[PDB]
Amino acid sequence: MALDNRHRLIVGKLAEAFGLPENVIEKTLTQDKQAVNSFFTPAGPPSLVFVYQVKEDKLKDGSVGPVDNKPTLHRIGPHERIHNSVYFTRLNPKGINEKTLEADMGSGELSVLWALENFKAIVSDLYLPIMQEQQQWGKMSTEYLEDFLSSTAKFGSMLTEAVADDDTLQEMEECLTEWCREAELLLNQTNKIKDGEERGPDTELEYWRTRMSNFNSITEHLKKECKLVLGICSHAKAYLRWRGLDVQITDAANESKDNVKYLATLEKSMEPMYQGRVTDITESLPALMTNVRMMYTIATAEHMTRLFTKITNQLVRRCKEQIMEDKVTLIGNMKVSVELANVYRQQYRLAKETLAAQPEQAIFLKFDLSSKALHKLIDMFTTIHQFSSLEQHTHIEGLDTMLKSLNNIID
Amino acid sequence: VKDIRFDYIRDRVCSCLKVPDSAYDKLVSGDGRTSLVQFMEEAHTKRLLIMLDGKDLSATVKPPPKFKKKTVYFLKLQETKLDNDNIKKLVIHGEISENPLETLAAISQDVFMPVLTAPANQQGWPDVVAKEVTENLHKFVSNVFVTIGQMKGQDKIHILESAIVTWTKQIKNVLKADLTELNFWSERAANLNSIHEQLTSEKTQKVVKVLELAKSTYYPAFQRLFREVEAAQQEANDNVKFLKLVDLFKPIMHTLMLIWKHSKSSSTRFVTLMQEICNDLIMQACKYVPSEAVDKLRMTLRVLGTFKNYYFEYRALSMQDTKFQNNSLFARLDSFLERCHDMMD
């Protein structure tokens, strides 16, 4: 409830961090003391953030600074390139003077570098154990929190992805040729992604995400701006090429955005089969065809080829791995896997029946070779296990070397 | 040199721990400053915790539940502390508060929506990614709001997206919310009334009408889910108002028959399962009771049991005057009765 005591506590802490000892730190926290009272005790402000910019040394020395720059003891703690913050958001509904200031007001000390590193550090990296320790310390609310921190991880992924006259004629040639060639390159990303490998369908989503990130980077890079103004001056060599590339870039960007958001809708029902159990995919497949069937009521060859070949690649990967880690277990797993392939083909043929009703090369090749190399081996093990009941009646006087014939046949 | 980093971290620790003493030598002189120097001189080392228990210090990672603790986090952005370029501007110099979940809620709703707003205003993300970061920061807000407390007790389209996504999630939370029996139904009445005026309050009403400037599909679904809320709420209230050495306390069992007399003059399955609860109390008492006295105490034990089954047939005859439950009471209580007939004989 005491404005001045917490004012001088934040003066001392912002001096110990910043180096502005007494004069303008205390003057700026003193100035407009109605709001300084109206954050601490009263309603309205839930923090009073002193941000301090710099204009001469780019704040690199950090030991101390003049106040020629404009510091803002403003309500918002903004994230620009230039000002180091202190928020002192208070963890008390009413400002109580008796409670100390450094046990509820967290300091706002911020690296002068931009929005990549500090925020992912403060969200994902630093806070790893306490919730987990609180996971250890008695909660039922364990569910959906692990994937909540996987959402923090994908924040980290996307911020790492995204944040990372003769003289005039010379400048025009110097900044055009390079960037036009790069744009022409980036309009060929659909071609270097058709290759021979058992690849997984999430790499599709990641390829489209890289297309998004590079499109955003180039379109921001063009929006250096003096060279655009130089282009406007120099229309009276690349400007035919620039309007052509602009039309190409707009069409590519629009189809990329539509593809990314619709391919993003698919993820929560294709997700169980990447790492789960072999029988789970059987139940997942009706949901999977509800998703795919609704999405081809909208938008073709690239979707069909990449989606179906890679998803069937992943089914082969999961079945073959989950079998490889004896007899009754193996025969059971082969029965389960053949039933999985059978229900997949059955539901795709039902899908083709519906697709014909209302208004498959990869499947053929991949599951036909898998199912034939499973029928042969499942019949071999059924025969072996049917001959395996012989294996312990060793005292009958006519089953001694007979089993060694069976042993050679096995071996 | 390591000395500029050492004295910088020392002056920061004297700033943030605020205990004037030579205690820096009393704790750090063991594993402390060696762990600090190996933290600063090794690759991949990205975190450090120091806890201030009022006056005491601990350089660690594991947070204890001791009150008045304070948290400071140290991270070198670089793998060493460089002699050439200054280390005073350390990328992570964090001081925090005792309770973590309150701070995460406060940081979500106070200090880091500027990261959502102003970098969106400046370069980098004018695309669908701005809509994405707004929506899942709203998800952050909703989650940190609900998982605390509930455990313990062109513009038009995107604004519609936010103000419909938060109710998709909150309805998932609501449908999750639809003496074990007594406390179960008391909790159900209390929680469902509390959510029922979490849904009929002012700002929710304005949100429903602002959304009803679109009138597309979702709002009949929230109408039907409110229909789910209200009847269960009132009926839970009704049965909560209804529900409000054993040799000395057989007359209490008359009270029990009278409760069944008075209540049923609800639904049958919970009635039979309440009888199961009564029988598990009776087995609790009949283990609480325990070579010639043993027959006497087991005679008393069967005597209480036959008053119990006699009150059952009294309730049956008075029901006739004013079928599976017999089999159920037989199952539980007769399993017990033959356990101790065997031991008594």
Side-chain angles (χ1 to χ4, degrees), chain A residues 165-223:
Chain A
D165 191 1
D166 63 329
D167 298 343
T168 69
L169 237 291
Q170 289 161 28
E171 199 50 60
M172 287 142 54
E173 92 231 353
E174 288 161 20
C175 279
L176 286 164
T177 50
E178 293 155 327
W179 305 348
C180 281
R181 289 298 104 78
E182 187 262 3
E184 284 161 338
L185 187 153
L186 204 66
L187 292 169
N188 318 127
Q189 288 286 101
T190 185
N191 311 120
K192 291 180 301 170
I193 55 163
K194 203 170 280 276
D195 283 310
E197 209 267 319
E198 276 79 342
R199 63 215 165 195
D202 71 322
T203 74
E204 196 264 9
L205 213 59
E206 198 78 0
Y207 152 83
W208 284 89
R209 264 281 311 261
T210 51
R211 268 271 285 274
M212 297 335 287
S213 195
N214 296 15
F215 268 28
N216 207 356
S217 284
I218 181 64
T219 44
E220 170 50 51
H221 167 52
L222 184 67
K223 283 160 201 144

XYZ file of all heavy atoms in Angstrom, chain A residues 165-223:
495
model
N 22.218 7.664 -63.774
C 23.355 7.725 -62.820
C 24.084 6.379 -62.848
O 23.438 5.343 -62.594
C 22.887 8.153 -61.426
C 24.015 8.498 -60.470
O 25.190 8.421 -60.885
O 23.709 8.852 -59.312
N 25.390 6.403 -63.113
C 26.152 5.134 -63.234
C 26.112 4.378 -61.903
O 25.894 3.164 -61.940
C 27.575 5.372 -63.752
C 28.444 6.210 -62.831
O 27.895 7.078 -62.126
O 29.668 5.978 -62.819
N 26.294 5.078 -60.781
C 26.319 4.412 -59.454
C 24.944 3.788 -59.197
O 24.890 2.645 -58.689
C 26.745 5.380 -58.349
C 28.146 5.929 -58.542
O 28.903 5.336 -59.336
O 28.464 6.946 -57.898
N 23.874 4.512 -59.546
C 22.502 3.982 -59.325
C 22.287 2.731 -60.190
O 21.636 1.789 -59.699
C 21.427 5.068 -59.479
O 21.331 5.459 -60.848
C 21.667 6.266 -58.589
N 22.781 2.741 -61.433
C 22.622 1.574 -62.344
C 23.373 0.395 -61.732
O 22.864 -0.768 -61.790
C 23.235 1.928 -63.703
C 22.308 1.818 -64.910
C 21.949 0.368 -65.197
C 21.056 2.658 -64.711
N 24.548 0.697 -61.182
C 25.361 -0.379 -60.591
C 24.535 -0.970 -59.449
O 24.360 -2.186 -59.436
C 26.721 0.167 -60.162
C 27.629 0.498 -61.336
C 28.740 1.438 -60.943
O 29.172 1.474 -59.794
N 29.212 2.210 -61.907
N 23.925 -0.117 -58.624
C 23.150 -0.635 -57.472
C 21.981 -1.480 -57.983
O 21.716 -2.520 -57.366
C 22.665 0.479 -56.548
C 22.297 -0.033 -55.169
C 23.375 -0.897 -54.536
O 24.498 -0.389 -54.347
O 23.095 -2.078 -54.250
N 21.300 -1.039 -59.047
C 20.114 -1.794 -59.531
C 20.582 -3.181 -59.957
O 20.014 -4.176 -59.461
C 19.494 -1.134 -60.763
C 18.754 0.142 -60.474
S 18.982 1.372 -61.777
C 18.479 0.422 -63.209
N 21.654 -3.247 -60.746
C 22.029 -4.601 -61.223
C 22.417 -5.415 -59.992
O 21.900 -6.554 -59.852
C 23.106 -4.527 -62.309
C 24.534 -4.617 -61.801
C 25.464 -3.525 -62.300
O 25.039 -2.739 -63.169
O 26.608 -3.459 -61.806
N 23.146 -4.795 -59.060
C 23.670 -5.520 -57.878
C 22.522 -6.108 -57.065
O 22.673 -7.253 -56.621
C 24.501 -4.585 -57.001
C 25.838 -4.208 -57.607
C 26.447 -2.959 -56.997
O 26.048 -2.604 -55.874
O 27.303 -2.336 -57.650
N 21.415 -5.392 -56.873
C 20.380 -6.038 -56.017
C 19.248 -6.738 -56.791
O 18.415 -7.381 -56.125
C 19.909 -5.121 -54.901
S 21.070 -5.127 -53.511
N 19.228 -6.690 -58.124
C 18.124 -7.435 -58.802
C 18.522 -8.875 -59.126
O 18.063 -9.761 -58.403
C 17.730 -6.714 -60.094
C 16.940 -5.419 -59.913
C 16.936 -4.595 -61.192
C 15.521 -5.709 -59.452
N 19.330 -9.094 -60.166
C 19.723 -10.399 -60.691
C 19.699 -11.464 -59.605
O 19.062 -12.516 -59.773
C 21.107 -10.314 -61.327
O 22.015 -9.683 -60.414
C 21.051 -9.552 -62.640
N 20.344 -11.184 -58.465
C 20.432 -12.186 -57.403
C 19.049 -12.569 -56.879
O 18.702 -13.757 -56.814
C 21.316 -11.667 -56.271
C 22.772 -11.509 -56.651
C 23.488 -10.480 -55.803
O 22.844 -9.493 -55.398
O 24.692 -10.668 -55.526
N 18.222 -11.570 -56.554
C 16.950 -11.851 -55.905
C 15.915 -12.395 -56.887
O 15.089 -13.229 -56.497
C 16.433 -10.594 -55.191
C 17.420 -9.984 -54.194
C 18.571 -10.549 -53.718
C 17.337 -8.687 -53.578
N 19.201 -9.698 -52.846
C 18.466 -8.547 -52.744
C 16.415 -7.636 -53.646
C 18.696 -7.401 -51.980
C 16.647 -6.496 -52.893
C 17.778 -6.388 -52.071
N 15.953 -11.975 -58.155
C 15.074 -12.576 -59.152
C 15.413 -14.042 -59.385
O 14.507 -14.878 -59.502
C 15.161 -11.804 -60.463
S 14.226 -10.277 -60.530
N 16.710 -14.376 -59.456
C 17.098 -15.779 -59.602
C 16.682 -16.606 -58.389
O 16.240 -17.754 -58.536
C 18.604 -15.882 -59.837
C 19.056 -15.389 -61.200
C 18.454 -16.213 -62.323
N 17.360 -15.539 -63.014
C 17.519 -14.584 -63.928
N 18.731 -14.175 -64.271
N 16.460 -14.037 -64.504
N 16.805 -16.036 -57.185
C 16.381 -16.750 -55.980
C 14.874 -16.978 -55.964
O 14.409 -18.055 -55.563
C 16.820 -15.984 -54.735
C 16.574 -16.722 -53.433
C 15.304 -16.275 -52.736
O 14.583 -15.425 -53.297
O 15.023 -16.779 -51.628
N 14.094 -15.980 -56.389
C 12.643 -16.144 -56.460
C 12.257 -17.199 -57.489
O 11.347 -18.010 -57.255
C 11.983 -14.810 -56.793
N 12.944 -17.201 -58.633
C 12.688 -18.212 -59.651
C 13.007 -19.606 -59.135
O 12.263 -20.555 -59.405
C 13.504 -17.899 -60.904
C 12.952 -16.755 -61.741
C 13.992 -16.170 -62.675
O 15.195 -16.349 -62.399
O 13.611 -15.545 -63.685
N 14.102 -19.741 -58.378
C 14.415 -20.996 -57.693
C 13.282 -21.433 -56.778
O 12.795 -22.565 -56.873
C 15.712 -20.832 -56.891
C 16.409 -22.001 -56.188
C 17.888 -21.683 -56.092
C 15.867 -22.240 -54.775
N 12.842 -20.539 -55.890
C 11.838 -20.892 -54.893
C 10.472 -21.157 -55.512
O 9.593 -21.697 -54.836
C 11.731 -19.781 -53.850
C 11.190 -20.181 -52.480
C 12.165 -21.123 -51.818
C 10.949 -18.963 -51.614
N 10.273 -20.792 -56.772
C 9.093 -21.250 -57.494
C 9.274 -22.639 -58.131
O 8.476 -23.005 -58.999
C 8.704 -20.220 -58.552
C 8.208 -18.932 -57.891
C 8.075 -17.795 -58.879
C 6.886 -19.196 -57.183
N 10.290 -23.412 -57.727
C 10.492 -24.782 -58.201
C 10.579 -25.784 -57.053
O 11.198 -26.841 -57.194
C 11.751 -24.911 -59.058
C 11.937 -23.770 -60.012
O 12.997 -23.148 -60.038
N 10.916 -23.481 -60.808
N 9.979 -25.478 -55.912
C 10.117 -26.364 -54.766
C 9.271 -27.627 -54.868
O 9.502 -28.570 -54.105
C 9.773 -25.602 -53.490
C 10.831 -24.600 -53.126
C 12.064 -25.270 -52.576
O 13.053 -25.442 -53.280
N 12.012 -25.650 -51.308
N 8.311 -27.678 -55.787
C 7.454 -28.849 -55.913
C 8.122 -29.999 -56.646
O 7.555 -31.096 -56.684
C 6.149 -28.494 -56.622
O 5.287 -29.639 -56.618
C 6.414 -28.064 -58.052
N 9.287 -29.771 -57.251
C 9.933 -30.755 -58.110
C 11.001 -31.567 -57.396
O 11.161 -32.755 -57.690
C 10.550 -30.067 -59.332
C 9.587 -29.119 -60.013
O 9.843 -27.920 -60.116
N 8.468 -29.655 -60.489
N 11.741 -30.965 -56.465
C 12.834 -31.653 -55.790
C 12.360 -32.454 -54.580
O 13.168 -32.778 -53.703
C 13.916 -30.655 -55.377
C 14.673 -30.044 -56.544
C 15.733 -29.066 -56.067
C 15.135 -27.936 -55.249
N 16.204 -27.136 -54.590
N 11.072 -32.786 -54.526
C 10.448 -33.498 -53.422
C 9.769 -34.778 -53.890
O 9.013 -35.386 -53.136
C 9.446 -32.590 -52.690
C 8.452 -32.060 -53.708
C 10.161 -31.430 -52.024
C 7.211 -31.503 -53.132
N 10.024 -35.196 -55.122
C 9.478 -36.424 -55.691
C 10.668 -37.352 -55.909
O 11.385 -37.227 -56.907
C 8.741 -36.134 -56.996
C 7.703 -37.162 -57.382
C 6.859 -36.672 -58.551
C 5.770 -35.708 -58.112
N 4.537 -36.394 -57.636
N 10.884 -38.278 -54.977
C 12.072 -39.119 -55.003
C 11.714 -40.514 -54.517
O 10.560 -40.799 -54.185
C 13.191 -38.500 -54.165
C 13.868 -37.350 -54.877
O 14.261 -37.527 -56.048
O 13.991 -36.263 -54.275
N 12.711 -41.395 -54.494
C 12.477 -42.775 -54.118
C 12.904 -43.137 -52.711
O 14.084 -43.396 -52.463
N 11.942 -43.185 -51.791
C 12.190 -43.562 -50.404
C 10.866 -43.849 -49.708
O 9.820 -43.311 -50.079
C 12.944 -42.465 -49.647
C 13.806 -43.000 -48.529
C 13.080 -43.007 -47.212
O 12.364 -42.029 -46.929
O 13.202 -44.003 -46.472
N 10.933 -44.703 -48.693
C 9.836 -44.928 -47.756
C 9.803 -43.759 -46.776
O 10.429 -43.789 -45.718
C 10.035 -46.255 -47.030
C 9.546 -47.514 -47.760
C 10.478 -48.014 -48.851
O 11.349 -47.259 -49.328
O 10.326 -49.187 -49.243
N 9.056 -42.716 -47.117
C 9.050 -41.490 -46.337
C 7.688 -41.260 -45.686
O 6.657 -41.727 -46.176
C 9.434 -40.298 -47.216
C 8.453 -40.037 -48.329
C 9.083 -39.535 -49.618
N 8.148 -39.640 -50.738
C 8.492 -39.561 -52.018
N 9.757 -39.348 -52.348
N 7.574 -39.676 -52.965
N 7.695 -40.530 -44.573
C 6.531 -40.399 -43.725
C 5.699 -39.158 -43.981
O 6.223 -38.099 -44.334
N 4.379 -39.264 -43.799
C 3.477 -38.177 -44.221
C 3.590 -36.878 -43.423
O 3.043 -35.866 -43.874
C 2.076 -38.789 -44.065
C 2.256 -40.089 -43.408
C 3.664 -40.518 -43.545
N 4.248 -36.853 -42.266
C 4.446 -35.577 -41.583
C 5.531 -34.731 -42.236
O 5.535 -33.500 -42.072
C 4.792 -35.802 -40.115
C 6.176 -36.365 -39.927
O 6.589 -37.212 -40.748
O 6.851 -35.958 -38.961
N 6.452 -35.366 -42.968
C 7.445 -34.616 -43.722
C 6.788 -33.773 -44.798
O 7.330 -32.739 -45.191
C 8.460 -35.558 -44.359
O 7.848 -36.224 -45.470
C 8.938 -36.590 -43.344
N 5.620 -34.201 -45.274
C 4.810 -33.383 -46.166
C 4.446 -32.063 -45.505
O 4.652 -30.982 -46.076
C 3.562 -34.167 -46.543
C 2.812 -33.673 -47.716
C 1.672 -32.777 -47.364
O 1.522 -32.379 -46.190
O 0.897 -32.512 -48.298
N 3.904 -32.139 -44.290
C 3.525 -30.939 -43.559
C 4.730 -30.053 -43.295
O 4.645 -28.824 -43.391
C 2.879 -31.333 -42.238
C 1.783 -30.438 -41.693
C 0.681 -30.359 -42.701
C 1.270 -30.997 -40.388
N 5.873 -30.664 -42.987
C 7.074 -29.868 -42.757
C 7.590 -29.205 -44.035
O 8.092 -28.074 -43.988
C 8.150 -30.735 -42.117
C 9.253 -29.943 -41.448
C 8.859 -29.385 -40.090
O 7.716 -29.613 -39.639
O 9.702 -28.708 -39.468
N 7.479 -29.882 -45.183
C 7.842 -29.266 -46.458
C 6.980 -28.051 -46.744
O 7.484 -26.997 -47.160
C 7.708 -30.287 -47.587
C 7.401 -29.695 -48.948
C 8.412 -29.186 -49.747
C 6.103 -29.666 -49.443
C 8.139 -28.654 -50.981
C 5.823 -29.129 -50.669
C 6.842 -28.620 -51.431
O 6.568 -28.095 -52.669
N 5.672 -28.181 -46.521
C 4.795 -27.036 -46.731
C 5.083 -25.911 -45.741
O 4.986 -24.731 -46.101
C 3.342 -27.480 -46.659
C 2.928 -28.185 -47.883
C 3.033 -29.512 -48.130
C 2.373 -27.603 -49.060
N 2.566 -29.805 -49.383
C 2.154 -28.646 -49.977
C 2.031 -26.308 -49.427
C 1.610 -28.432 -51.228
C 1.501 -26.098 -50.678
C 1.285 -27.154 -51.560
N 5.474 -26.253 -44.514
C 5.856 -25.231 -43.544
C 7.114 -24.484 -43.976
O 7.217 -23.265 -43.787
C 6.059 -25.876 -42.177
C 4.849 -25.796 -41.278
C 4.730 -24.435 -40.633
N 5.991 -24.024 -40.027
C 6.265 -24.141 -38.732
N 5.368 -24.666 -37.912
N 7.436 -23.739 -38.257
N 8.087 -25.197 -44.548
C 9.275 -24.524 -45.067
C 8.930 -23.611 -46.237
O 9.511 -22.527 -46.381
C 10.323 -25.547 -45.492
O 9.715 -26.515 -46.351
C 10.903 -26.239 -44.283
N 7.989 -24.040 -47.084
C 7.525 -23.169 -48.160
C 6.896 -21.895 -47.613
O 7.177 -20.795 -48.108
C 6.530 -23.913 -49.050
C 7.156 -24.616 -50.235
C 7.223 -23.694 -51.427
N 5.922 -23.521 -52.061
C 5.427 -24.341 -52.980
N 6.116 -25.408 -53.351
N 4.298 -24.043 -53.603
N 6.077 -22.021 -46.565
C 5.511 -20.849 -45.895
C 6.592 -19.918 -45.364
O 6.532 -18.698 -45.567
C 4.591 -21.279 -44.755
C 3.375 -22.085 -45.168
S 2.803 -21.831 -46.857
C 2.075 -20.200 -46.727
N 7.575 -20.480 -44.656
C 8.604 -19.664 -44.021
C 9.445 -18.925 -45.055
O 9.737 -17.733 -44.893
C 9.486 -20.533 -43.130
O 10.268 -19.740 -42.253
N 9.817 -19.602 -46.140
C 10.631 -18.937 -47.147
C 9.822 -17.897 -47.913
O 10.351 -16.831 -48.253
C 11.256 -19.965 -48.080
C 12.212 -20.874 -47.358
O 12.212 -20.927 -46.130
N 13.046 -21.584 -48.108
N 8.538 -18.174 -48.179
C 7.695 -17.175 -48.830
C 7.557 -15.931 -47.966
O 7.641 -14.804 -48.471
C 6.314 -17.756 -49.128
C 6.191 -18.376 -50.485
C 7.294 -18.918 -51.117
C 4.967 -18.413 -51.130
C 7.179 -19.490 -52.367
C 4.848 -18.981 -52.378
C 5.955 -19.519 -52.997
N 7.377 -16.116 -46.658
C 7.280 -14.970 -45.761
C 8.592 -14.200 -45.710
O 8.588 -12.964 -45.719
C 6.874 -15.419 -44.363
C 6.154 -14.331 -43.596
O 6.023 -13.206 -44.080
N 5.677 -14.657 -42.400
N 9.721 -14.915 -45.687
C 11.020 -14.253 -45.635
C 11.275 -13.416 -46.881
O 11.707 -12.264 -46.782
C 12.132 -15.284 -45.441
O 12.171 -15.737 -44.100
N 10.987 -13.964 -48.067
C 11.263 -13.204 -49.287
C 10.286 -12.038 -49.431
O 10.681 -10.930 -49.821
C 11.279 -14.115 -50.534
C 11.599 -13.305 -51.793
C 9.967 -14.848 -50.747
C 12.977 -12.689 -51.784
N 9.009 -12.244 -49.080
C 8.047 -11.159 -49.226
C 8.290 -10.053 -48.214
O 8.017 -8.889 -48.510
C 6.614 -11.680 -49.111
O 6.519 -12.608 -48.022
C 6.184 -12.349 -50.408
N 8.830 -10.376 -47.038
C 9.215 -9.317 -46.114
C 10.500 -8.632 -46.565
O 10.619 -7.406 -46.463
C 9.362 -9.885 -44.701
C 9.980 -8.936 -43.680
C 9.317 -7.577 -43.663
O 8.076 -7.524 -43.561
O 10.036 -6.561 -43.752
N 11.453 -9.410 -47.088
C 12.724 -8.867 -47.557
C 12.521 -7.856 -48.678
O 13.225 -6.842 -48.745
C 13.616 -10.022 -48.020
C 14.820 -9.598 -48.803
N 15.702 -8.637 -48.359
C 15.274 -9.995 -50.014
C 16.655 -8.470 -49.258
N 16.419 -9.283 -50.271
N 11.552 -8.110 -49.560
C 11.260 -7.142 -50.613
C 10.579 -5.901 -50.050
O 10.843 -4.782 -50.503
C 10.405 -7.781 -51.705
C 10.114 -6.871 -52.901
C 11.397 -6.595 -53.673
C 9.061 -7.480 -53.814
N 9.717 -6.071 -49.050
C 8.962 -4.954 -48.493
C 9.843 -4.037 -47.647
O 11.018 -4.322 -47.418
C 7.794 -5.464 -47.643
C 6.599 -5.965 -48.435
C 5.721 -6.884 -47.590
C 4.853 -7.781 -48.464
N 4.678 -9.145 -47.893
